Design an enzyme around this catalytic site. Structure first.
Site, PDB file in Angstrom:
ATOM      1  CB  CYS A  35      -0.924  -0.016   1.213  1.00 40.37           C
ATOM      2  SG  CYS A  35      -1.746   1.553   1.551  1.00 40.37           S
ATOM      3  CB  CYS A  38      -0.307   2.161   4.138  1.00 40.51           C
ATOM      4  SG  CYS A  38      -1.923   1.579   3.576  1.00 40.51           S
TER       5      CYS A  38
END
Length: 111
Positions: A35, A38
């Site tokens: 991700c 993230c």
């Protein structure tokens, strides 16, 4: 009462028991090593846990085996995803990278 990694079915069941029946202030943070966003949200969540010290943020890596079915049984459509619980019920579901909503919800719910 901070950021807590959840790696097993048992740990997740215990965390959801605290968030639902237990009515403790709880956030579920669904992430992954792949991700992109993230990478800058995870640090933000660390700093926020110091601002709201009684909240518990359960950080979940969706690639983790063991909780493999909990994920599919949750209809996770994107990482990051954040689930917010207060008073035993869900108060928010931020799907995708939106730190504005994350910060607004942390303050509205847990100030």
């Amino acid at each position: 009462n901070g950021v807590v990694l959840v790696k097993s079915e048992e740990e997740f069941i215990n965390a959801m028991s605290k968030a639902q029946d237990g009515s403790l202030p709880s956030v579920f943070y669904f992430t992954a090593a792949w991700c992109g966003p993230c990478r800058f949200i995870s640090p933000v969540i660390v700093e926020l846990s110091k601002q709201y010290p009684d909240v518990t943020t359960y950080k979940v890596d969706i690639d983790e085996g063991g909780i493999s079915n909990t994920i599919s049984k949750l209809n996770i459509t994107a990482v990051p995803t954040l689930h917010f619980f207060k008073g035993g019920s869900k108060k928010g579901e931020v799907v995708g990278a939106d730190v504005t909503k994350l910060k607004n919800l942390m303050e509205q719910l847990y100030k």
